[PDB]
């Protein structure tokens, strides 16, 4: 069966309150921006997963991630259904940013919240336009 899956997304903030986004380039050459994150693993808390995923992807250490939002999205093309849980955290070591999954992400960069790219990964787009169940404002 094709069951709904649970994804964790992390809005990682730096000292200037910018957020980290990762550029992905598709097979059609289309670019989109996504935050850090990936699949909740069996046995994990949302906060454990967030911390682990951020470290694995970016080399950044975040602390005390805060629950922000839930989105429920079906990806038509891929026939995938994800419930995304978003959390936010400040990183402690922003100068140690490294692209640790360069086959998945072209590059990471910091963006001001008033200067986000347009082409955002669907769940993040939903979050930004508040088409989600929003616990806390991002700011």
For binding to a copy of itself (CB under 8 A), which residues are involved?
A: 1-6, 39-43, 45-46, 67, 70, 72, 74, 81, 83, 85, 133, 135
116 or 138: whose CB is closer to a copy of itself?
Answer: 138
**Shortest CB 39 distance to a copy of itself, Å:** 7
- Say how far apart CA 10 and CA 47 lie, in whole Å: 10
22 or 37: whose CB is closer to a copy of itself?
Answer: 37
Please provide residue 31's backbone torsions phi and psi, each rounded to the nearest 5 degrees: -95, 145
Residue 11: name the closest of 131, 135, 111 by CA.
Answer: 111
**Shortest CB 122 distance to a copy of itself, Å:** 15
**Shortest CB 104 distance to a copy of itself, Å:** 18
**Shortest CB 1 distance to a copy of itself, Å:** 8
Tokens 């001001």 -> residue:
112
For the record, the structure tokens of 51 come out as 């911390």
For the record, the structure tokens of 108 come out as 């990471």
Q: How many CA atoms lie within 13 A of 14 on its CB side?
A: 16
18 or 47: whose CB is closer to a copy of itself?
Answer: 47
């Amino acid at each position: 069966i094709n069951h709904p899956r649970i994804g964790i997304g992390i809005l990682i903030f730096n000292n200037r309150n910018e957020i980290l986004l990762g550029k992905r380039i598709s097979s059609h050459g289309e670019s989109s921006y996504a935050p850090a994150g990936g699949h909740l693993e069996f046995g994990e808390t949302f906060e454990e997963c967030a911390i682990r995923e951020v470290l694995e992807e970016t080399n950044l250490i975040i602390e005390n991630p805060q629950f922000i939002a839930v989105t429920n999205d079906i990806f038509e093309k891929e026939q995938k259904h994800y419930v995304s849980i978003f959390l936010k955290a400040h990183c402690l070591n922003e100068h140690e940013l490294q692209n640790l999954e360069p086959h998945k992400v072209e590059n990471w960069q910091w963006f001001a919240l008033d200067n986000l790219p347009s082409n955002l990964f669907l769940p993040l787009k939903r979050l930004i336009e508040k088409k989600c169940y929003l616990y806390k404002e991002i700011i």
